Design a protein around this nucleic acid. Structure first.
Ligand code: ZN
Lengths: 81, 108, 96, 142, 62, 94, 55, 108, 93, 82, 97
DNA sequence: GGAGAATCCCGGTGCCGAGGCCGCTCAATTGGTCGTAGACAGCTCTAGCACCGCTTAAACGCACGTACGCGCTGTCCCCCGCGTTTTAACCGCCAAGGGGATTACTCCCTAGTCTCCAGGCACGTGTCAGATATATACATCCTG
DNA sequence: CAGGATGTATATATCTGACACGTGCCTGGAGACTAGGGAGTAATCCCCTTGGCGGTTAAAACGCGGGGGACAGCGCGTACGTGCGTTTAAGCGGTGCTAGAGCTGTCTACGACCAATTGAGCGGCCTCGGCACCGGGATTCTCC
């Protein structure tokens, strides 16, 4: 088992994401909130992905399962069949 | 030796497979029965949409001094055109990036 | 010799808005994904394509959220994004 | 849940179930008498009890073992009663079940019976139902 | 012999009526004898020619 | 040996008809296939809903016209309807 | 009154029903999903109360 | 023949299992439909209706009234987090809005 | 003379089961019918999508369980799945 | 040919009471034109779907079910009209 | 004489209109607007009263939601008066434009 | 305006992913036939449209004055830019294997039809919960 | 803080019409049945996933300096809420007309279905060139 993997999302990574988003200056408290928001989003997507996988009776999560989970949230993703 | 095999797309001068579209329709649990002209119309619409997207992507690529279409070019073409942007406002494209723009307030 | 603050920020904005590379490190992202998935089914297994698709979707979502929060911060007559701006953007979008 | 079975049994020992009777601990034998002013009056009817390991949250498997002429009881003695299928509750005693059984014997329900022919007889010719019920009570219950 | 229910294994030899087997099943499991039928009362296991390890299959409850 | 089917050949043909001297990446072809599948699913679902609403049982070109008008916005929808009508007319003549 | 209303055993971690009924944690957490989601004593519905007090 | 018992009575439900099955087989959702699917669906629908109605009745009794109205339904839906999330994109006719005022606007 | 069908009777029965002494407006019944129809359409569509994804052709309790888990959020889904399994158990028994 | 003055039919007090229901404390004077522009855009979007539904139905009048379908297809499902 | 300070009447109006469920727009001008809008897509169209009521309900609900969003945005702007900038921001964030 | 640091472009190189050739089989086509969904005529009548008239509450317009939006200013702290140090991602390599995709098959579940009936639908009905009216108490604000 | 002006909730009265109730009937649900194919199960093969290892180094964390921007503050103008007096179409209600929705009854083009035929796309299997990369010259922006 493992834990405290949310810190793998480094401050420079968050800064790069914000710069791609078009942010000039960033406050110091943005990082913890971004961590929380990303954790919530990943939980929501992975819940549906795992449900789709376990419905098909297999132990491997597939790109099609992830695509279906994203599609059911109105955020269809191309490039994975 | 009944007749020369001519596809319905060739009859209509199309490119997309009318027979494949018909098979997908009748295998998709969409309705009990399928009309004759429905696959032809659907193939025509799909061909027009693909042609428009490819034209925009090719123009974007030639504006980038490139010869191969890439997901970045596709994303630029989709985001630039208002019609396609509204059609695919909820669609994420892998390796697409973002449309380059900076708010005037941030500029010095 | 030093640049005035913000100029390198603008240049890196230009650098990143043109490239399509992934901005999160694959190994810690995959570790986080597996850690999150531990809470639904144990000893799960993942496909590399599935993990990459998750990373693409997460990065696109975060970029959109950052665009919205930057817009809100500008609306608040300032250039520094603050957590209240992110909260406002998420509330308006209906995520909470 | 054995204590609850014994506590009800101890209470049932403290309060005998009138003309009816029951008792053995999952398998119990229930013996009831004919209700007054009924075609079954005088006859003694025996019933079976099976206790599942969910009492009092699940009704016991209870059926008739004496041949009878009643629309709501089949040839094998099964019982069509709400408190045994739907209206079961852990807040009632077996004595209440016995009283309801006696009432159903006095007042058969033709809307949802177990023997449609006997239900038709009961609904159409009440005297015929009473006669045949008394005859079967004399033949089997007596 | 052996008997299978399609479930309590095993049961009596091919010499008893279906009523006795139904009563035994009801006593051992709690499922009513009338639930549900015999698929493969007056007839016996020998009348239906039920051999060893035969596959047997077991109403209007309301 | 699952013989999977896509639209790569037809997409390539259309690309060559539009730009005869332009290439396409492999990943771009997958994106085009996903886009075609998504649009096909949208149009088919809308046509099925229209047929159910009108208490019909046959999906014809008339339903597809209304589905296209519902989905595609404005000038794009008008051009798509014109192209589909022309194609159906030519097919019926043939 | 120190015993549960159903099991008649010692009240271990007593749970207070909204209808003033007292029952032990085993009996309560069994009757939550046992038969009818209702109160055996006075037929008081508890599904909403159970959901509210679970969190 | 024999006494007729409804499938809802078999399952101890209130919603029509037969009607649900007919709708499933008439909605062109699949070529064939399993036996327990209408039962499960009717059970789920009954549970959801009961859950909504209990909250609506509690809202009405807190309002000292005896009839459930769309205002009560809207209050019950918008007060429960789960139901609000399930019906976040649903508009109720004659439902009104949830009464709340931002603390900033209050006098101080 | 087309006989149109709704869920008003069953909704009324459920209302009597929950609150035995509470009424409901006529327009509220239309809202309840619309809600029931919407939920039915959502669940049926999700089950059909699951069946197509798994390359199946039959809708069973598995597909509906998966659809309910996907749709209903949090503790609400837990109770709903519990109710459905119990109903199937009684029907199968 | 119905005149274009009907957009002014949405009165300033009506917009103000809509804002009051929405929880607005006070309103700037410039809002009353932006709001009626937004309302007309939304109504155009919904009616464009309702009319094409009716046309596909080969009818001359717009039923309530057409409006319900148009609102549903925009993720704005409406209860209380069937 | 008697003169309430500004704001209190607004607060009581908020309390009143957040408790009622009636339509807040006039039926006849709303019908005229709907008929004017629909006359360019296709002429000589007819409407059901139920359809018009459904359109009015949807429009009022959408406007109330938009006003809630723009009020939240304006409060975020450290102000108490709504202005078209806030409405534009809400529309942009909700992806309607 | 010059220094410097980054950015863009041109040239040579090599690769590897895009483009092209070859079965062959399965998915496409062609031809018949038949039940039928849909197209059309026809009749009915229900609901939409248009109108008139009287009531009036709602919309409109004006004055003001006050509370709020906005501009200016000092500060000051925190966030950006830089450098040095630390470390873990990563590419490469190998190995074990649990688990995904197919085949056979068989058997049990579900489609289909027939017959029967009863629960729900359309329709009367009366009574009872909600609304309006009006006189109360009760709470709120506001200017002193 | 207090009392008056002003809403505002509440008790009781009586109306009223909406809904909970009762009834004829009818069609869709239930039952018994056979047949056929969808899928559950085993076994099998192999392939992608997990796990590990070691050298590189680009990336991340620490830290220091400074400057600029968020923030509290202040003053001022103005515009919008609040009230009151003056129009005005919304609303009701009522009447009348009629076009189009809804239905039933015929009839036929046509699309599903089956038999028979064949060739276009999939897969493989190649060949080469578009582009990534590396060094260097020219250009540009930024700062003092
Ligand atoms: Zn207990």
């Amino acid at each position: 088992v493992l834990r405290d993997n949310i810190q793998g999302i480094t401050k420079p990574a968050i800064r790069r994401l914000a710069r791609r988003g078009g942010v000039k200056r960033i406050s110091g408290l943005i990082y913890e909130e971004t961590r929380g928001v990303l954790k919530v989003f990943l939980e929501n997507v992975i819940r549906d992905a795992v449900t789709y996988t376990e419905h098909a009776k297999r132990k491997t999560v597939t790109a099609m399962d992830v695509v279906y989970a994203l599609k059911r949230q109105g955020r269809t993703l191309y490039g994975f069949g | 030796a009944r007749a020369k095999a001519k596809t319905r797309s060739s009859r209509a001068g199309l490119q997309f497979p009318v027979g494949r579209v018909h098979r997908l329709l009748r295998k998709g649990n969409y309705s009990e029965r399928v009309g004759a002209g429905a696959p032809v119309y659907l193939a025509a619409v799909l061909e027009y949409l693909t042609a428009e997207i490819l034209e925009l992507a090719g123009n974007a690529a030639r504006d980038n001094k490139k010869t191969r279409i890439i997901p970045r070019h596709l994303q630029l073409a989709i985001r630039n055109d208002e019609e396609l942007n509204k059609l695919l406002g909820r669609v994420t494209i892998a390796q697409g990036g973002v449309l380059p723009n900076i708010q005037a307030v941030l500029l010095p | 010799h030093r640049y005035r603050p913000g100029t390198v920020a603008l240049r890196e904005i230009r650098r990143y808005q043109k490239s399509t590379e992934l901005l999160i490190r694959k190994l810690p992202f995959q570790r986080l994904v597996r850690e999150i998935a531990q809470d639904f089914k144990t000893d799960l297994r993942f496909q590399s394509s599935a993990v990459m698709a998750l990373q693409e979707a997460s990065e696109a979502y975060l970029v959109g959220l950052f665009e919205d929060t930057n817009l809100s911060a500008i609306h608040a007559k300032r250039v520094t994004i603050m957590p209240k701006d992110i909260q406002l953007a998420r509330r308006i979008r209906g995520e909470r | 849940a054995l204590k609850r079975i014994n506590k009800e049994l101890s209470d049932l020992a403290r309060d005998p179930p009138a003309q009816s009777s029951a008792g053995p601990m999952f398998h119990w034998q229930a013996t009831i008498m004919g209700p007054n002013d009924s075609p079954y009056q005088g006859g003694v009817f025996f019933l079976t009890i099976h206790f599942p390991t969910d009492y009092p949250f699940k009704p016991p498997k209870v059926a008739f073992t004496t041949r009878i002429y009643h629309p709501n009881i089949n040839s094998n003695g099964s019982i069509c009663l709400d408190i045994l299928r739907s209206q079961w509750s852990p807040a009632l005693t077996i004595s209440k079940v016995l009283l309801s059984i006696s009432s159903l014997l006095s007042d058969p329900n033709p809307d949802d019976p177990l023997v449609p022919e006997i239900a038709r007889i009961y609904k159409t010719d009440r005297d015929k139902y009473n006669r045949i019920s008394r005859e079967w009570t004399q033949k089997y219950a007596m | 012999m052996q008997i299978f229910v399609k479930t309590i294994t095993l049961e009596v030899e091919p010499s008893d009526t279906i009523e006795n087997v139904k009563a035994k099943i009801q006593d051992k499991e709690g499922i009513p004898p009338d639930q549900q039928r015999l698929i493969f009362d007056g007839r016996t296991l020998s009348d239906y020619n039920i051999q060893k390890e035969s596959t047997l299959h077991l109403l209007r409850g309301c | 040996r699952s013989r999977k089917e896509s639209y790569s050949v037809y997409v390539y043909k259309v690309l060559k008809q539009v730009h005869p001297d332009t290439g396409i990446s492999s990943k771009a072809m997958g994106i085009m296939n996903s886009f075609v599948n998504d649009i096909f699913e949208r149009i088919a679902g809308e046509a099925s809903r229209l047929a159910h609403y009108n208490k019909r049982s046959t999906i014809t070109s008339r339903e597809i016209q209304t589905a296209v008008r519902l989905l595609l916005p404005g000038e794009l929808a008008k051009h798509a309807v014109s192209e589909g009508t022309k194609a159906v007319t030519k097919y019926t003549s043939a | 009154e120190c015993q549960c209303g159903i099991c008649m055993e010692i009240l271990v971690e007593p749970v207070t029903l909204p209808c003033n009924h007292t029952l032990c944690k085993p009996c309560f957490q069994s009757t939550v999903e046992k038969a009818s989601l209702c109160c055996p004593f006075c037929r008081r519905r508890v599904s909403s109360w159970t959901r509210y007090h679970t969190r």
